[PDB]
Amino acid sequence: AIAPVITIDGPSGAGKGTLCKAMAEALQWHLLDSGAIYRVLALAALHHHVDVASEDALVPLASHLDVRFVSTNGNLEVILEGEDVSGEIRTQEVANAASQVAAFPRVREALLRRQRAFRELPGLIADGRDMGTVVFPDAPVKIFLDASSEERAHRRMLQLQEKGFSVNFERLLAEIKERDDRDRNRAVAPLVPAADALVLDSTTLSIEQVIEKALQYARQK
Numbered sequence: 321a322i323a324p325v326i327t328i329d330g331p332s333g334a335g336k337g338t339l340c341k342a343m344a345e346a347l348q349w350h351l352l353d354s355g356a357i358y359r360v361l362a363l364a365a366l367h368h369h370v371d372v373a374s375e376d377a378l379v380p381l382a383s384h385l386d387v388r389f390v391s392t393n394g395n396l397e398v399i400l401e402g403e404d405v406s407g408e409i410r411t412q413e414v415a416n417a418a419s420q421v422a423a424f425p426r427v428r429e430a431l432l433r434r435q436r437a438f439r440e441l442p443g444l445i446a447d448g449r450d451m452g453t454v455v456f457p458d459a460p461v462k463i464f465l466d467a468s469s470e471e472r473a474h475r476r477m478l479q480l481q482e483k484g485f486s487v488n489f490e491r492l493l494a495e496i497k498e499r500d501d502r503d504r505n506r507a508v509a510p511l512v513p514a515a516d517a518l519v520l521d522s523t524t525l526s527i528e529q530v531i532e533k534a535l536q537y538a539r540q541k
């Protein structure tokens with residue numbers, strides 16, 4: 321046969337990570353965190369002293385990327401050149417370089433096959449920005465998860481406060497809107513929902529409500 325795919329695209333902080341984890345465990349399917357791929361590439365670029373603003377330098381790197389994602393266990397592992405870098409790919413230095421690296425056409429092309437190879441029995445839950453528009457446009461189920469920038473800033477703020485970091489609302493809001501513009505105003509694979517995508521706005525919905533509506537739509541298809 322051929323493996324079914326559910327694509328979940330959306331902006332930063334929309335809750336994609338949580339939803340993809342809940343669905344993959346519910347359905348007992350495979351999970352693809354596409355953002356982690358651009359993040360590992362960026363980190364390997366930072367470590368190997370490759371200029372992140374140079375498409376020519378990045379290609380040999382993207383095409384020779386030694387990385388493994390260790391099979392869901394309950395928590396996910398990202399292994400770069402044999403080292404577990406799961407925590408390091410989540411730092412600001414990496415997320416920043418990742419947006420630059422992601423903006424190159426030839427870099428994105430070098431990563432297509434790698435991503436598509438995740439589609440396997442019994443199915444794939446793909447998390448990203450362009451899963452339903454570029455990598456899996458043939459996806460039978462497409463969901464575009466969104467939320468207001470103000471709500472997303474508030475959510476990020478409460479997270480930081482739980483960890484004991486000082487932050488003020490105004491800066492978080494400016495930071496997420498900048499991430500939005502770069503994602504949406506991107507010339508290559510910009511953040512735009514698929515024509516056949518279920519637009520799911522979580523602004524005033526709880527995590528359980530998002531999950532429930534997601535799995536119902538998916539099963540009803």
Ligand SMILES: Nc1ccn([C@@H]2O[C@H](COP(=O)(O)OP(=O)(O)O)[C@@H](O)[C@H]2O)c(=O)n1
Nearest residue numbers: 332354355356358415418419422448449450
């Ligand atoms: N399918 C994807 C996934 C991520 N990305 C980029 O990867 C970088 C970060 O991935 P992420 O979504 O895991 O983290 P944030 O940028 O939301 O902080 C972002 O700059 C995204 O635009 C992409 O271009 N295409």
